[PDB]
């Protein structure tokens, strides 16, 4: 999953930069100002793996608001979807790492 997540991260970076190409200049500060609310989060969970209460966090995107990508060009939605898939993959990797440590 180290190389899998590296591949997925570079895919997400390409998608975001393609959205930037769609919207002229970089998403930059317009994207940065949308840090008011988080569209993705790691929900709390506890899975008893082999009798040990491992704290494997479960990724859960926010279903209430997704306005952080509502700006500029239409490719922002596709870029947000690619980045959300990448975030889900990375959250799975982080949950596996936490399980490994515990």
């Amino acid at each position: 999953a180290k190389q899998k997540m590296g591949r997925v991260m570079q895919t997400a970076a390409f998608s975001l930069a393609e959205v930037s190409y769609a919207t002229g200049e970089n998403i930059g500060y317009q994207v940065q100002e949308s840090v008011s609310t988080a569209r993705f989060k790691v929900r709390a969970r506890q899975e008893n793996v082999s009798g040990v209460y491992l704290s494997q966090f479960e990724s859960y995107i926010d279903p209430e608001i997704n306005d952080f990508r509502l700006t500029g060009l239409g490719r922002g939605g596709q870029q947000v979807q690619r980045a959300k898939e990448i975030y889900s993959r990375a959250v799975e990797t982080l949950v596996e790492l936490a399980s490994l440590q515990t």
Partner: protein, 115 residues
Amino acid sequence: AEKRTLIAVIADEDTTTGLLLAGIGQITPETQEKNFFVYQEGKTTKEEITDKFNHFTEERDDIAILLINQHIAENIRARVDSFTNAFPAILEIPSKDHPYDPEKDSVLKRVRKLF
């Protein structure tokens, strides 16, 4: 602990932008803060990066994971001990401007050494 989104303190600017686009940051009206630190790679001091990493990993009480994507030595040195108590402060090494080689990955190094 309470759920939180992964921080990108030690990630690249592009990685931070991607995380923000995905929605991996939330505001903190209590102190005008945010769930993700500024990825000022090549501009912020190493001590500042270490302080931000400590604040996200020790001062913060939420369950936010962390991003160390191609992090500078300011985070590489800290990662030898920051992995302890991986909850609520988780750690990870995404991709960044520099390639995300597994050679510098502390978690991968520990996993290999345990073998």
